[PDB]
Write an enzyme that holds these catalytic residues in place. Structure first.
Site, PDB file in Angstrom:
ATOM      1  N   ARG A 159     -10.397 -23.480  -3.500  1.00 30.06           N
ATOM      2  CA  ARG A 159     -11.696 -23.991  -3.084  1.00 30.06           C
ATOM      3  C   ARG A 159     -11.570 -25.308  -2.333  1.00 30.06           C
ATOM      4  NH1 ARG A 159     -13.379 -21.355  -8.694  1.00 30.06           N
ATOM      5  NH2 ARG A 159     -15.283 -20.249  -8.092  1.00 30.06           N
TER       6      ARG A 159
HETATM    7  N1  LIG Z   1     -20.214 -18.951   3.844  1.00 31.54           N
HETATM    8  C1  LIG Z   1     -18.886 -18.936   3.605  1.00 31.54           C
HETATM    9  N2  LIG Z   1     -17.980 -18.870   4.599  1.00 31.54           N
HETATM   10  C2  LIG Z   1     -16.657 -18.853   4.364  1.00 31.54           C
HETATM   11  N3  LIG Z   1     -16.138 -18.903   3.131  1.00 31.54           N
HETATM   12  C3  LIG Z   1     -16.933 -18.973   2.047  1.00 31.54           C
HETATM   13  C4  LIG Z   1     -18.380 -18.990   2.231  1.00 31.54           C
HETATM   14  N4  LIG Z   1     -18.929 -19.061   1.017  1.00 31.54           N
HETATM   15  C5  LIG Z   1     -17.919 -19.083   0.121  1.00 31.54           C
HETATM   16  N5  LIG Z   1     -16.732 -19.027   0.737  1.00 31.54           N
HETATM   17  C6  LIG Z   1     -15.427 -19.041   0.058  1.00 31.54           C
HETATM   18  O1  LIG Z   1     -15.597 -18.603  -1.282  1.00 31.54           O
HETATM   19  C7  LIG Z   1     -15.369 -19.673  -2.194  1.00 31.54           C
HETATM   20  C8  LIG Z   1     -16.435 -19.669  -3.275  1.00 31.54           C
HETATM   21  O2  LIG Z   1     -16.668 -20.991  -3.733  1.00 31.54           O
HETATM   22  P1  LIG Z   1     -18.135 -21.496  -4.111  1.00 31.54           P
HETATM   23  O3  LIG Z   1     -19.142 -20.535  -3.568  1.00 31.54           O
HETATM   24  O4  LIG Z   1     -18.183 -22.914  -3.626  1.00 31.54           O
HETATM   25  O5  LIG Z   1     -18.218 -21.542  -5.712  1.00 31.54           O
HETATM   26  P2  LIG Z   1     -18.903 -20.408  -6.617  1.00 31.54           P
HETATM   27  O6  LIG Z   1     -17.784 -19.845  -7.439  1.00 31.54           O
HETATM   28  O7  LIG Z   1     -19.931 -21.161  -7.410  1.00 31.54           O
HETATM   29  O8  LIG Z   1     -19.466 -19.423  -5.641  1.00 31.54           O
HETATM   30  C9  LIG Z   1     -15.387 -20.937  -1.370  1.00 31.54           C
HETATM   31  O9  LIG Z   1     -14.484 -21.914  -1.879  1.00 31.54           O
HETATM   32  C10 LIG Z   1     -14.958 -20.471  -0.009  1.00 31.54           C
HETATM   33  O10 LIG Z   1     -13.535 -20.523   0.098  1.00 31.54           O
END
Ligand SMILES: Nc1ncnc2c1ncn2[C@@H]1O[C@H](COP(=O)(O)OP(=O)(O)O)[C@@H](O)[C@H]1O
Ligand SMILES: Nc1ncnc2c1ncn2[C@@H]1O[C@H](COP(=O)(O)OP(=O)(O)OP(=O)(O)O)[C@@H](O)[C@H]1O
Ligand SMILES: Nc1ncnc2c1ncn2[C@@H]1O[C@H](COP(=O)(O)OP(=O)(O)OP(=O)(O)O)[C@@H](O)[C@H]1O
Ligand SMILES: [Mg+2]
Ligand SMILES: [Mg+2]
Ligand SMILES: [Mg+2]
Lengths: 188, 501, 47, 469, 486, 157
Positions: free
Chosen positions: B372
């Site tokens: 992340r």
């Molecule tokens: N819109 C996006 N575009 C590209 N990568 C994404 C996107 N949303 C999430 N990701 C990837 O998926 C991971 C999910 O992390 P995040 O959504 O911040 O935490 P959670 O587990 O609460 O969903 C992110 O670290 C990122 O690497």
């Protein structure tokens, strides 16, 4: 921990634990007879309608209970053992079952001095001559030092015969079981 | 409702007014020892989670403060405690020594040296149970922690101050990732860039001592022990020690963090700290929960992993990276504790046990491994090469179960996948990783045979390390791959390729 | 238990991977043809 | 009054009083602590004992310590001064800028608006996200949920929603972070300061952060939701203005209750959850509502343990939302981001009367074509795809194009994708999906639609791919 | 001090007061706390009483004084409730003033015996084709509506409620149906939008909305179904016809489980006490159809159940499936592929059956059922379509048309005669020469056309309740003429 | 199960005998893809031994992955490299089976000790392809690969 002296008879439950504690306290200092006296006196005291009703309400602070019990144990100049016991019960909240405690102690004292209890059951009363010969024979069951503590009783259910309980031993001279045994034998 | 202390041995003291003779404030008597948990009567002034000291040298940690007794847990075997033993306070919340003295010692959960080289000469002590930094002290993870493992540094970059999670079935190579990481930092620690030194801590939880001894031998072999601590709470050790080992290690690391230094700490495994905690709770008669795990087995790990932070420059600029290791059962990453920890960390390396036979070692299952923190914690040169490499692997991963263009794509993907294999205890400098990745991703291996890339990697690395160290030094110092450096690499790759066959 | 729609992809077994790969193959081919046709149209349209 | 601690077991402390007894939910301050420890009463056990849950670590408590009954539930500062600050569960600041000096204090426990106080209007709230706006449009004043597994896009999506809406909002905002990473809390704080939403010098901040991150003992993670909700309550009622309220996560509010439940002496429910799960969540989710005297546009991220939407916690939450956007791991594996699942995200304003006939027809067309594609994949598994008829190869191709077109690059994901974040107003989304369905783009490759904004950008990308071919 | 008519709280917490005293309190009796809070005495133990508080325990200290009201729980009844929104005890929550009901009833009364009832024979018109033809519902039935999330159950219930407006606005008195909608564990704003929706269709002059929402204490959600069922038994026992809709019956089970687990009763399966069958059976067994000696009234019931992942083998779904006279599955896979209402007609059933259909709808749906049964066993081929004989080809060309006739829209129930006309056109064969995508349009056109010109024919079908061969011929002529000019 | 799951962490080398293999008649039923060791290191057992062992495991794992399709679409729906892989994998599965001395009373066959070099050589040959002409059963319950060749000769008459 200390080496509490084991009472002769063992009782169990909260009643038995408090009774054993008190017996080992009194046995040291050799205050059994007097301690029993104060116990059978608090037996009368606690039955007082005012105290009886006050000590069963759970909405009077426990400290109030302890203060009242200290007041009612100072007036009678109870031995320190009994005052401490009652304060302990009030602190822990078990005084609601004091009669079980003191009663247990009474039992635990009888077994001390040899009053091996007995019990005789019959379908009718017993002539004092017959009852006296009965006591004389039952005395032969015990050991030296022990003394019989007879308790007559009556049941209509058993037709005739008799039933005797001597501590743990149990002899069913009744005619009910004899009739049942004969009926089983003449069926099976 | 029968109190534990409503026994005859105690009520007798109370009745005959002898209780005043003994101290029941800073001292206590064991009511009942059994199965590694003591109940103690007394200690009316003992603090919750305080340490206490039995009358035979054993220590304990007063967990339960019940109205009439105290549930103490023995940091040892209760074979020596007896009903009636005198328990006396120690006065202080359980704390462990810390400092640079521990470096290179196989310390034990409580800070005692079990390597037999003499006492730890530490100076300061930290409470194991301390709160993690707040919102304000931290800053965003920016520096890279070089794992030294092509796949991890390329597609799953790990920064300093970041809590990864090496999760995979038993015997897939998690400890191997951890020890590659520990050994790699040798190059930085043997240097003058005091801002890149990383001090390692290995917490070995519920592992047979033969394993820890072989690991310590492996670390001494690479002389990676002068900057390593090893907190060893092995299987034979009472449950409380295995439950406290992670916190002892984490505090030893919070030391280096609170002094502008950078630490790495590797809990291995956390799924065995959870088991030790469950045993403790069940033996304190605390009600169970899922799979008998106590109700609060999430807080147990959250409050541990939240201490891996990256302090701002007003707080010294220190750092504490954490690399918890979890063990799934049958790839069931959706179990209770694996799911508890997967949502506490930020990133995760998925070791699959069938990538591990199909040939891929390390088994890292890219595509399911995430970071992340992401590219934010990577080097510019590695950013450049990984940008193309990750994308090409991502494309090859959806046409793997098999034209000309797509055939070229599959060839390139297999080339890369053979470029991500690696040995053991042989990590690579970032410069060499970027060199070989660039060699493989431009196309300078689109013709060589698949089975020959495994050896071309080694040959090309030896060639560069023996002939063009100036280029690698330039790439590493500059951080990024400059255009003249790119041309030099192009020349070198083509030259070696032509004369390799 | 019953059967849903599109459960082969959900299962993720060998059949799910095989299906996804087959679909990607076919649409890679068609995308190549469409890109070629788009370039050809863009050259035929300058005139 | 003044009681004394009598037992400490985990985060559950029993306190014995001799004066009057403190009613439930009161806050009791433990005397003799370096930092304020507050115990919130939770049970009356009889004998003038109360069982309580410590809002902060119970390290170093001693049996017999003294405890003072504050006399009222946890009271927190409120007003337009909390804007730009950061607060604990107990309301004292944690951003190291001095005390929050307000006139108004509010108790975090308060009944919910009565049935005679609710609003019944619904107007779509354009967010700039194609999938969310098209298949499950949000609504002003409505409650919104983002159901995700781990690592699917809940937090990135909620940051995108903050960036988009909170910046272009006339009213205030609140972000209560319940029991999620502290790294993320710091990241958000710095992002806002660097984006002007928060302002350290002057009084021009529009966000009142509240944090109960996952290092707080369960007594604290289970209450910080109520604290952020109290701040939002005030802004809704006293200011008489519109409000936003982002909560992340709302699962931890349930998980913390589960953690403390057993020690409180409760038999556990189905899956180890507390027996009071449904009501302990209703008493909270029923205060997050629009009323005749205000409006809250609450958005909530919701963990779904192990991607199990049938778990008791998400299953129970589903009933408390006006719109759900179920992020999916399977879609996120295909690289489509946001991962929103088109055939599981629903809404209450998706009606031909509230959003218009054409929007509704297009949304239902998208859903139906995707479902048909799902059915076809089963056949494609065996036959191969060359065997498909010519009315279905078209269906599969169109469905793949629509799947790709539902993806979009956000402005907060520039770190990952590198692309530039886009906003697609509603008209572009509806027009582009109309065209993709009608067949006006059978000549472009599907990859032309991957991670683009309006449809014209997909056309331009297709042209660029062709040229560079 | 009095410890027979009065007692004092020993303990409180999580909504379960433990009272000491109240020696003369009956089981399931309504006691009152000193703080103006009511409660229901559930556990009578030798040493104390377990009272469940109807509200917030914040106001229940320890040592409070509890006084028994001397009565079992009771609720108001009458036509004074119609159009109101009451809570689980009869208190109004719509702020239109007091309720002003003279009568009262006990929530926990027993169901009618075996002799009072009579076999269900009248049709309860739901105004939904898929229901009224394939899974009919009589008066006195108990027809579970079991489905997943957001599949359209509440919409089935509200279409049923809205449809009865045509009967309630007429002058026939034995066709009037009064609706009750018990809303259990629902966001208040949902109930408010629902009341607005009912007002829009003017269906709120014969509806009683009983509201036990999420914020309400567990006992109110436990008690709402019984309040509603009593307000419905009042209409049953007075020669009137009622229709009570519990929504859902799974949340009553959850609330009951919470109370039990807090009273410390042995958990059982999924932590549900041993009474989650008795609880629902002694509720759903009050939907009866009294014979003429008892008034002739009736009381239908439409319990709504949510199933997690289409799992109908769970505890409560099976408990309520073995109690009821049918079930209307609502699958989501069908919801998203155009079939709305998504009534899976394979799994749906009605053990009452066609005994509760008007003779016309019997005449038509009898063959529609078989046509769809045949279609459902060659549905898989639909994709292949070709490469098959004309037999299965015609089977699945009739099935598609029949399916597309059963699609319907929000809050627009159809009169029985119009459903009969549409299904007649579809099944007699006047549509097999039409592209399926246009079928709906045809319907929405044909319907209107018939409504405008041929009202007399519809009146004759409605009154005769049968398709007389004269009416049959006239309808065939109408269909042929219209279909010609389309 | 908690008991074996816990004991897995106290062993150097595990050997997971599986009922699925034993029902095929292979004995010892050892599961090749669950058995592990801590001395499977190229610096401990050399490079030829390690490479042969890892090639065996790779091919067995590939065949296991194929089994899902094979069980429905038959082997007539595999590429030619896949058919060849399946043939080699079945040969190897059989060749791993051995007759023990203590199982003479069961099997009657004579118990064999296969020296390590003979094992490495035989598996190296099977992987190279020197025996793609023999049938699977030629490898069932034999010692070194010489006996496999001899049994294949016997079967051909
Ligand atoms: N819109 C996006 N575009 C590209 N990568 C994404 C996107 N949303 C999430 N990701 C990837 O998926 C991971 C999910 O992390 P995040 O959504 O911040 O935490 P959670 O587990 O609460 O969903 C992110 O670290 C990122 O690497
Ligand atoms: N990159 C690699 N190349 C070859 N073999 C490897 C590699 N990584 C790990 N292994 C092998 O995997 C085996 C187990 O590795 P390791 O013990 O590190 O994994 P583990 O899962 O931590 O083990 P356990 O879980 O049983 O403690 C070792 O015998 C080692 O030789
Ligand atoms: N007959 C229908 N035609 C078209 N759409 C429908 C129909 N019935 C329901 N829907 C749609 O389905 C969605 C969910 O409807 P509904 O509220 O009836 O389901 P529910 O099961 O009550 O939901 P929940 O389980 O959340 O209470 C609504 O947005 C509605 O527009
Ligand atoms: Mg290991
Ligand atoms: Mg998150
Ligand atoms: Mg509903």
């Amino acid at each position: 921990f200390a080496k509490l002296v084991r009472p002769p008879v063992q009782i169990y439950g909260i009643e038995g634990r408090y009774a054993t504690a008190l017996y080992s306290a009194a046995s040291k200092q050799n205050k059994l007879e007097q301690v029993e006296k104060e116990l059978l006196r608090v037996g009368q005291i606690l039955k007082e309608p005012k105290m009886a009703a006050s000590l069963l309400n759970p909405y009077v602070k426990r400290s109030v209970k302890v203060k009242s019990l200290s007041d009612m144990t100072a007036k009678e100049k109870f031995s320190p053992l009994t005052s401490n016991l009652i304060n302990l019960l009030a602190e822990n909240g078990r005084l609601t079952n004091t009669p079980a405690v003191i009663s247990a102690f009474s039992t635990m004292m009888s077994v001390h001095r040899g009053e091996v209890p007995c019990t005789v059951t019959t379908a009718s009363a017993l002539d004092e001559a017959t009852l006296t010969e009965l006591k004389t024979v039952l005395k032969s069951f015990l050991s030296k030092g022990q003394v019989l503590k007879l308790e007559v009783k009556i049941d209509p259910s058993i037709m005739g015969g008799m039933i005797v309980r001597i501590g743990e031993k149990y002899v069913d001279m009744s005619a009910k079981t004899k009739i049942q045994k004969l009926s089983r034998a003449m069926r099976e | 409702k029968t109190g534990t202390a409503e026994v005859s041995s105690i009520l007798e003291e109370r009745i005959l007014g002898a209780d005043t003779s003994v101290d029941l404030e800073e001292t206590g008597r064991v009511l009942s020892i059994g199965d590694g948990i003591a109940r103690v009567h007394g200690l009316r002034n003992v603090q919750a989670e305080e340490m206490v000291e039995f009358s035979s040298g054993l220590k304990g940690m007063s967990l339960n403060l019940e109205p009439d007794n105290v549930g103490v847990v023995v940091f040892g075997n209760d074979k020596l405690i007896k009903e009636g033993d005198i328990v006396k306070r120690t006065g202080a919340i359980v704390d462990v020594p810390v400092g640079e003295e521990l470096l290179g010692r196989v310390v034990d959960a409580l800070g005692n040296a079990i390597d037999g080289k003499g006492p730890i000469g530490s100076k300061a002590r930290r409470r194991v149970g301390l709160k993690a930094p707040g919102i304000i002290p931290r800053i965003s993870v920016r520096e890279p922690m070089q794992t030294g493992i092509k796949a991890v540094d390329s597609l799953v970059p790990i920064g300093r101050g970041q809590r990864e999670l090496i999760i995979g079935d038993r015997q897939t190579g998690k400890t191997s990732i951890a020890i590659d990481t520990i050994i790699n930092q040798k190059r930085f620690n043997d240097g003058t860039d005091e801002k890149k030194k990383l001090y390692c801590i290995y917490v070995a939880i519920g592992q047979k001592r033969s394993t820890v001894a072989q690991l310590v031998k492996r670390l001494t072999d690479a002389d990676a022990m002068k900057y390593t601590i090893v907190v060893s709470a092995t299987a034979s050790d009472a449950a409380p020690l295995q439950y406290l080992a992670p916190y002892s290690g984490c505090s030893m690391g919070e030391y280096f963090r609170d002094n502008g230094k950078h630490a790495l700490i590797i809990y291995d495994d956390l799924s065995k700290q959870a088991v030790a905690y469950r045993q403790m709770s069940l033996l304190l008669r605390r009600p169970p929960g899922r799979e008998a795990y106590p109700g609060d087995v999430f807080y147990l790990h959250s409050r541990l992993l939240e201490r891996a932070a990256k302090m701002n420059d007003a707080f010294g600029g220190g750092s504490l990276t954490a690399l918890p290791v979890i063990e799934t059962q049958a790839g069931d990453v959706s179990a209770y504790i694996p799911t508890n920890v997967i949502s506490i960390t930020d990133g995760q390396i998925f070791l699959e046990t069938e990538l591990f036979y199909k040939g891929i070692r390390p088994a890292i299952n890219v595509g399911l491994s995430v970071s992340r923190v992401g590219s934010a914690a990577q080097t510019r040169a590695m950013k450049q090469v990984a940008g193309t490499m990750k994308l090409e692997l991502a494309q090859y991963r959806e046409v793997a179960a098999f034209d000309a263009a797509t055939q070229q794509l599959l060839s390139r993907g297999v080339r890369l996948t053979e470029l991500l294999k690696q040995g053991q205890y042989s990590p690579m400098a970032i410069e060499e990783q970027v060199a070989v990745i660039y060699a493989g991703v431009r196309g300078y291996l689109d013709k060589l045979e698949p089975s020959k890339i495994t050896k071309f990697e080694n040959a090309f690395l030896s060639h560069v390390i023996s002939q063009h160290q100036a280029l690698l030094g330039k790439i590493r110092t500059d951080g990024k791959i400059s255009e003249e450096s790119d041309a030099k690499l192009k020349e070198i790759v083509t030259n070696f390729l032509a004369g390799f066959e | 238990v019953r059967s849903s729609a599109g459960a082969v992809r959900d299962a993720g077994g060998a059949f799910g991977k095989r299906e996804q790969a087959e679909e990607e193959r076919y649409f890679r081919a068609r995308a190549k043809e469409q890109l070629a046709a788009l370039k050809k149209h863009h050259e035929n349209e300058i005139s | 009054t003044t009681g004394r601690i009598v037992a400490v077991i985990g985060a559950v402390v029993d306190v014995q009083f001799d004066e009057g007894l403190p009613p439930i939910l009161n806050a009791l301050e433990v005397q003799g602590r370096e930092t304020r420890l507050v115990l919130e009463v939770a049970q009356h056990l009889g004998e003038s004992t109360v069982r309580t849950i410590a809002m902060d670590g119970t390290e170093g408590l001693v049996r017999g310590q003294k405890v003072l009954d504050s006399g009222a539930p946890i009271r927190i500062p409120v007003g337009p001064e909390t804007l730009g600050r950061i607060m604990n569960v107990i309301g004292e600041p944690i951003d190291e800028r001095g005390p929050i000096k307000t006139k108004q204090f509010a108790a975090i426990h308060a009944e919910a608006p009565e049935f005679v106080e609710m609003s019944v209007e619904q107007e779509i709230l354009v967010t700039g996200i194609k999938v969310v706006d098209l298949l499950a449009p949000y609504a002003k004043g409505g409650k919104i949920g983002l159901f995700g597994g781990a690592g699917v896009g809940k937090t990135v999506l909620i940051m995108e929603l903050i960036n988009n809406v909170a910046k272009a909002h006339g009213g205030y905002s609140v972000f209560a972070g319940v029991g999620e990473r502290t790294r993320e809390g710091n990241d958000l704080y710095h992002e806002m300061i660097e984006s002007g939403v928060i302002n350290l010098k002057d009084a021009t901040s529009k966000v009142a952060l509240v944090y109960g991150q996952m290092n707080e003992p369960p007594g604290a993670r289970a209450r910080v939701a109520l604290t952020g909700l109290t701040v939002a309550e005030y802004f809704r009622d006293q200011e008489g203005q519109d409000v936003l309220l982002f909560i992340d996560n709302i699962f931890r509010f349930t998980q913390a209750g589960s953690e403390v439940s057993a020690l409180l002496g409760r038999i556990p429910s189905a899956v180890g959850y507390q027996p009071t799960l449904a009501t302990d969540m209703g008493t909270m989710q029923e205060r997050i509502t629009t009323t005749k005297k205000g409006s809250i546009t609450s958005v909530q991220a919701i963990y779904v343990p192990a991607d199990d939407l049938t778990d008791p916690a998400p299953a129970t939450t589903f009933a408390h939302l006006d719109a759900t956007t179920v992020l999916s791991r399977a879609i996120a594996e295909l690289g489509i981001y946001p991962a929103v699942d088109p055939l599981d995200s629903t809404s209450r304003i998706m009606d031909p009367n509230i959003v218009g006939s054409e929007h509704y027809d297009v949304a239902r067309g998208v859903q139906k074509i995707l479902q048909d594609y799902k059915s076809l994949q089963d056949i494609i598994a065996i036959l191969g795809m060359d065997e498909l008829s010519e009315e279905d190869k078209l269906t599969v191709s169109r469905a793949r194009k629509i799947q790709r077109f539902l993806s979009q690059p956000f402005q907060v994901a520039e770190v990952f994708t590198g692309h530039l974040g886009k906003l697609v107003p509603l008209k572009e989304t509806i027009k582009g999906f109309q065209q993709i369905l009608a067949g006006e783009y059978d000549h472009l490759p599907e990859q032309a639609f991957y991670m683009v904004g309006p449809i014209e950008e997909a056309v331009a990308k297709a042209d660029k791919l062709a040229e560079e071919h």
